[PDB]
Design a protein around this motif. Structure first.
Motif, PDB file in Angstrom:
ATOM      1  N   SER A  27     -37.542  28.722 -86.740  1.00 52.11           N
ATOM      2  CA  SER A  27     -38.602  27.912 -86.077  1.00 52.11           C
ATOM      3  C   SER A  27     -38.463  28.017 -84.557  1.00 52.11           C
ATOM      4  CB  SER A  27     -38.354  26.476 -86.541  1.00 52.11           C
ATOM      5  OG  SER A  27     -38.921  26.295 -87.831  1.00 52.11           O
ATOM      6  N   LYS A  28     -37.256  27.990 -84.063  1.00 54.60           N
ATOM      7  CA  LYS A  28     -37.047  28.091 -82.590  1.00 54.60           C
ATOM      8  C   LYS A  28     -35.552  28.185 -82.277  1.00 54.60           C
ATOM      9  CE  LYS A  28     -40.538  25.859 -81.367  1.00 54.60           C
ATOM     10  NZ  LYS A  28     -40.871  24.409 -81.451  1.00 54.60           N
ATOM     11  N   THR A  42     -27.373  21.823 -80.812  1.00 52.97           N
ATOM     12  CA  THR A  42     -28.283  22.585 -81.718  1.00 52.97           C
ATOM     13  C   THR A  42     -28.357  24.052 -81.288  1.00 52.97           C
ATOM     14  OG1 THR A  42     -29.540  20.541 -81.921  1.00 52.97           O
ATOM     15  CG2 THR A  42     -30.669  22.602 -82.466  1.00 52.97           C
ATOM     16  N   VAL A  45     -32.828  26.629 -84.624  1.00 50.05           N
ATOM     17  CA  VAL A  45     -33.571  25.842 -85.650  1.00 50.05           C
ATOM     18  C   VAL A  45     -34.038  26.761 -86.784  1.00 50.05           C
ATOM     19  CG1 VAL A  45     -35.546  24.322 -85.838  1.00 50.05           C
ATOM     20  CG2 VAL A  45     -34.288  24.474 -83.684  1.00 50.05           C
ATOM     21  N   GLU A  47     -35.822  26.832 -91.186  1.00 54.63           N
ATOM     22  CA  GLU A  47     -36.516  26.035 -92.237  1.00 54.63           C
ATOM     23  C   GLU A  47     -36.697  26.870 -93.508  1.00 54.63           C
ATOM     24  OE1 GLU A  47     -40.426  24.446 -91.694  1.00 54.63           O
ATOM     25  OE2 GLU A  47     -39.615  22.943 -90.381  1.00 54.63           O
ATOM     26  N   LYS A  50     -35.500  22.681 -96.604  1.00 55.94           N
ATOM     27  CA  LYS A  50     -35.032  21.347 -96.126  1.00 55.94           C
ATOM     28  C   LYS A  50     -33.502  21.312 -96.085  1.00 55.94           C
ATOM     29  CE  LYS A  50     -37.858  19.204 -94.613  1.00 55.94           C
ATOM     30  NZ  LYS A  50     -39.221  19.760 -94.391  1.00 55.94           N
ATOM     31  N   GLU A  52     -31.745  23.169 -93.171  1.00 57.95           N
ATOM     32  CA  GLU A  52     -31.344  23.923 -91.948  1.00 57.95           C
ATOM     33  C   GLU A  52     -31.823  23.195 -90.689  1.00 57.95           C
ATOM     34  OE1 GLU A  52     -31.452  26.342 -94.666  1.00 57.95           O
ATOM     35  OE2 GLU A  52     -29.380  26.246 -94.084  1.00 57.95           O
ATOM     36  N   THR A  53     -33.065  23.366 -90.325  1.00 56.12           N
ATOM     37  CA  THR A  53     -33.586  22.684 -89.104  1.00 56.12           C
ATOM     38  C   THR A  53     -32.670  22.961 -87.909  1.00 56.12           C
ATOM     39  OG1 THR A  53     -33.733  21.016 -90.848  1.00 56.12           O
ATOM     40  CG2 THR A  53     -34.745  20.500 -88.722  1.00 56.12           C
ATOM     41  N   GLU A  54     -32.629  22.067 -86.959  1.00 55.56           N
ATOM     42  CA  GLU A  54     -31.755  22.280 -85.770  1.00 55.56           C
ATOM     43  C   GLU A  54     -30.314  22.549 -86.213  1.00 55.56           C
ATOM     44  OE1 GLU A  54     -33.746  18.645 -84.046  1.00 55.56           O
ATOM     45  OE2 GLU A  54     -34.764  19.824 -85.535  1.00 55.56           O
TER      46      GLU A  54
END
Length: 84
Positions: A27-28, A42, A45, A47, A50, A52-54
């Motif tokens: 994502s970033k 962090t 990021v 995905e 649900k 992983e994320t930062e």
């Protein structure tokens, strides 16, 4: 100087990097390689399911080279970021 013999069978995981579980959707990214980090910073990021994320760095240290890339999905199994 150098030689080319194809590279099928593995990737380029060095020593210390963290290979993903199977795949996901970036994502970033935050660190830009060659950047120091702390425990909780962090690093980037992601995905996939649900889970992983930062991604906060595991411990203080510096990156030697980033393997994962932005806008890159379904790319697990290979080291994502190198640290040590």
């Amino acid at each position: 100087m150098k030689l080319k013999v194809t590279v099928n069978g593995a990737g380029k995981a060095g020593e210390g990097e963290i290979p993903a579980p199977l795949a996901g959707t970036v994502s970033k990214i935050l660190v830009k390689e060659g950047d120091t980090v702390k425990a909780g910073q962090t690093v980037l990021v992601l995905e996939a399911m649900k889970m992983e994320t930062e991604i906060n760095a595991p411990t203080d240290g510096k990156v030697e080279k980033v393997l994962v890339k932005e806008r890159d999905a379904v790319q697990g199994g290979q080291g994502l970021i190198k640290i040590g």
